[PDB]
């Protein structure tokens, strides 16, 4: 009954969402055509959080899709579980992003977001009780970084109370697949810090390292990375869709994980991640899940958490579980290393349980940590921005489209003060 | 409750351990697939000392293979019973020590030891109560002597209250297969006397003589030598897995045997070993088992115990038996051969009984002697080491790779005082 609305923007956002709806639809048991052909009757009870019955059981997912070129909507419709998306939810442009934050957020924003707010508001009226918004987009692009950010501004201006999960991927040195990442990263993070509520930050090098080390894959690709991100995005909302020994709503996650309003850039990881070669050797037990969680090699972001201090953390668990073993593990891990957690907070770790594990498993978890070692993520982009902007590199694409260098300087200043705040709380 | 983790170093160690698991898995009743299909419950009742349950009746051994080549591991996997192993334990490089102690202890050892300690830590943490480790290796190679020595030293710097059963296949001259055996053997025993706590001496010369004389085999390949060594290794440690009238575990054996803080080099036998023609024309009485057990052409060592006194001895019988018969047998042996026993230790011999014999053999026994004849093997390797080292033959392969000359001389001195302590106490 607590509604969730999903917003997809950018090519990466569209692909990630087309995989996330894949996982959610298959686990609630709706077949590709759009009807309901599940097995158990416990999944039927909460399909309203993500789906609307139109007429005759043709469930339509409650999602908004946006971009600037039809070359992504074509792929979205082509891919599996493509027919489910309501055809009214394909707001697309005609020009293209161009990787310029100016085109993303100022020029095309005016003629696209004004048109997509109609769809999002109609969806909000169609659903009854909005719990919040979940938006999956990009920070290294033109549509997700700029147009998605301006849409975030407009949505927060409209609904102040609702929470916002911002599933955002960020650029990286080793996997820098384009040459103006710093600009479109700073100009997006400046609004993201002020305007969002839970920043789920991801990347590509972390996902590749996961698919190489933990999953032992041979040729990992965007399909696999998006599958992992989908698994996390389903685990984060498992609680609203299924009952359990101790429920955990989105506002509860925010309250237990945020000690200061602008300190809300979390880092997420999944568990268990085991190879198909050695599926039948490991033991799906709480100590093993917690050992796999609390380590750098599983975090889905380029952060070395042991080079920082976990301010807070949260652990969702799924499966017929004993909260006694769960919280003794969460306390033993906390007391082994008191240095890596902050001094002035007792019980740095929140735990929650649900009684239905995901399809294809029997026992799972999801770790969301508010650490202070995530400052170096933004530090890399900040130093790249300084080096590039000191010589006005590529600056004309921005300063010829209604933008002033004051914007660049202030965005850099905001990133600097945020990273200073993280560094201070250590 | 007690736990043993088994580590295999080098090609010799890997083959011996593979055959050992082939034997012990059968003695516990589990097939190569990993699913129990035996008969009784006395097997399953204490298999937790070796195996871990994975997922519904899939038992995985607690062993770690390790070397510097992929070919040996490929052979081990291709062989029978190799499936049970967890693929995560398979740690290896690609270059190869090449019978070089400097490679096996300083370059490749350094570059693999940090990785291997991760997996040994995983196994030693997944357990509940450790009593000691097992290591299988040679003393005449690079991946086995130097790397095994580095591994056991790294273990001692971490678990300073535990034993290791280091089964060392000593390089025999008449069965030598590489040009520089002593340059490895001396430099390995240097630290074997310092760190390892129960070094079990074995030699291909004595194994081949046993096979030729007693077994009357025609074409003894390494299979049967590994079979004998595995039978000994599985028999030494049944006091844990099986309940006996007089139970004696590893610490009891160590404290009973080792009189002085550095005389841990055991010479080992096993009964009954028969040809399949004379197994129909013999009686397996307890006196007969004891006589074969003390038969000097049955100990797995090239040093005939007639060339010295016995510091102490221990016997481990298997099968329902008579404890008084055991004790009177050993008393008769000691009284008849009183000239071979140390005068300042009354009742130099220890006896233990387990109510389960190795399957097929309705009765069996094992012998662990601490006789002072062990000095023969060490003088017989020291002669070769001095003979080579007088003119620095084959020495540049180590000096250029990082070892000064003084280390070899210090190893000489340590070997000399080790071989001199036995002479002193004889």
């Amino acid at each position: 009954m607590r509604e969730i609305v999903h917003i997809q923007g950018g090519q990466c956002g569209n692909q990630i969402g087309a995989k996330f709806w894949e996982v959610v639809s298959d686990e609630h048991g709706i077949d590709p055509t759009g009807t309901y052909h599940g097995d158990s009757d416990l999944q039927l009870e909460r399909i309203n959080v993500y789906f609307n019955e139109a007429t005759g059981g043709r469930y339509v997912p409650r999602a908004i899709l946006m971009d600037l070129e039809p070359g992504t909507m074509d792929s979205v419709r082509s891919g599996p579980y493509g027919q489910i998306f309501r055809p009214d939810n394909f707001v697309f442009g005609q020009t293209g992003a161009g990787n310029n934050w100016a085109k993303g957020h100022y020029t095309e924003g005016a003629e696209l977001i004004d048109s997509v707010l109609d769809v999002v508001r109609k969806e909000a009226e169609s659903c009854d009780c909005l719990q919040g918004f979940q938006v999956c987009h990009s920070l290294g692009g033109g549509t997700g970084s700029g147009m998605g950010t301006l849409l975030i501004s407009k949505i927060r201006e409209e609904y102040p109370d609702r929470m916002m999960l911002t599933f955002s991927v960020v650029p990286s040195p080793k996997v820098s697949d384009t040459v103006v990442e710093p600009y479109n990263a700073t100009l997006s993070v400046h609004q993201l810090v002020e305007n969002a509520d839970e920043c789920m930050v991801l990347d590509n090098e972390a996902l590749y390292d996961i698919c190489f080390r933990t999953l032992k894959l041979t040729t990992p690709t965007f399909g696999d990375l998006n599958h992992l991100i989908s698994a996390v995005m389903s685990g984060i909302t498992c609680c609203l869709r299924f009952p359990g020994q101790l429920n955990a709503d989105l506002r509860k996650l925010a309250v237990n994980l945020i000690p200061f309003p602008r300190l809300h850039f979390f880092m997420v990881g999944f568990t268990p991640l085991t190879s198909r070669g050695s599926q039948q050797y490991r033991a799906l037990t709480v100590p093993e899940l917690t050992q796999q969680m609390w380590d750098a090699k599983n975090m889905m972001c380029a952060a070395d958490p042991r080079h920082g201090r976990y301010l807070t953390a949260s652990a969702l668990f799924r499966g017929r579980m004993s909260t006694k073993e769960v919280d003794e593990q969460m306390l033993n891990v906390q007391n082994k290393n008191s240095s890596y957690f902050v001094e002035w907070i007792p019980n740095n770790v929140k735990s929650s349980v649900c009684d239905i594990p995901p399809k294809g498993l029997k026992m799972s978890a999801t770790f969301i940590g508010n650490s202070t070692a995530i400052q170096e993520m933004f530090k890399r982009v900040s130093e790249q921005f300084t080096a590039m902007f000191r010589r006005k590199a590529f600056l004309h694409w921005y300063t010829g489209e209604g933008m002033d260098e004051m914007e660049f300087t202030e965005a850099e200043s905001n990133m600097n003060d945020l990273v200073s705040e993280y560094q201070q709380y250590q | 409750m007690r736990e043993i983790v088994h580590i295999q170093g080098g090609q010799c160690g890997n083959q011996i351990g593979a055959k050992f698991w082939e034997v012990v898995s059968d003695e516990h009743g589990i097939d190569p697939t990993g699913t129990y299909h035996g008969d009784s419950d006395l097997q399953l009742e204490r298999i937790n000392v070796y195996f871990n349950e994975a997922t519904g009746g899939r038992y995985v051994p607690r062993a770690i293979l390790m070397d510097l080549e992929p070919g040996t591991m490929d052979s081990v996997r291709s062989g029978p019973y190799g499936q049970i192993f967890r693929p995560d334990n398979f740690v290896f490089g690609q270059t190869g020590a090449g019978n070089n102690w400097a490679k096996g202890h300083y370059t490749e050892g350094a570059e693999l030891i940090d990785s291997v300690l991760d997996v040994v830590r995983k196994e030693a943490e997944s357990c509940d109560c450790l009593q000691g480790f097992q290591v299988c290796h040679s003393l005449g190679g690079g991946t086995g002597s130097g790397m095994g020595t580095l591994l056991i030293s790294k273990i001692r710097e971490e678990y300073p209250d535990r034993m290791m059963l280091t089964f060392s296949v000593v390089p025999s001259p008449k069965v030598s297969d590489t040009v520089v055996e002593p340059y490895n053997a001396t430099l390995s025993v240097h630290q074997l006397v310092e760190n390892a706590d129960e070094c079990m001496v074995l030699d291909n010369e004595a194994l081949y003589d046993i096979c030729f004389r007693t077994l009357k085999l025609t074409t003894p390949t390494f299979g049967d030598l590994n079979h004998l060594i595995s039978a000994v290794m599985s028999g030494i440690t049944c006091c844990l897995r099986f309940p006996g009238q007089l139970n004696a575990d590893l610490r009891k054996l160590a404290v009973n045997l080792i009189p002085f803080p550095r005389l841990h080099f055991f010479m080992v036998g096993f009964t009954p070993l028969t040809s399949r023609g004379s197994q129909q024309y013999r009686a397996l009485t307890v006196p007969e088992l004891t006589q074969q057990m003390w038969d000097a052409k049955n100990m797995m060592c090239a040093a005939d115990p007639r060339h010295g006194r016995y510091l102490t001895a221990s016997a481990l019988f298997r099968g329902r038996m008579s404890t008084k018969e055991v004790d009177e047998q050993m008393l008769n042996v000691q009284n008849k051969n009183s000239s071979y026993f140390v005068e300042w230790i009354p009742n130099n011999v220890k006896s233990s009984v387990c109510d389960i014999p190795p399957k097929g053999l309705k009765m069996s026994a094992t012998f662990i002697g601490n006789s002072t004849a062990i000095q023969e093997m060490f003088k017989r390797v020291s002669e070769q080491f001095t003979a080579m080292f007088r003119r620095k033959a084959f020495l540049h392969w180590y000096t250029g790779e990082g070892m000064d000359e003084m280390e070899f001389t210090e190893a000489e001195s340590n070997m000399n005082d080790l071989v001199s302590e036995y002479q002193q106490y004889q």
Partner: protein
């Protein structure tokens, strides 16, 4: 050097256990006062 340190730590633990067991055996010093008073 780490080997020596670990050996010394084990010796310290042994002496700890010895002291605690001697305490448990004896008591199970506050007895002399009442002994003399009686």
């Amino acid at each position: 050097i780490t080997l020596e340190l670990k050996e010394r730590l084990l010796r310290c633990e042994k002496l700890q256990a010895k002291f605690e067991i001697i305490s448990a055996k004896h008591r199970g010093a506050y007895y002399v006062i009442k002994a003399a008073q009686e």
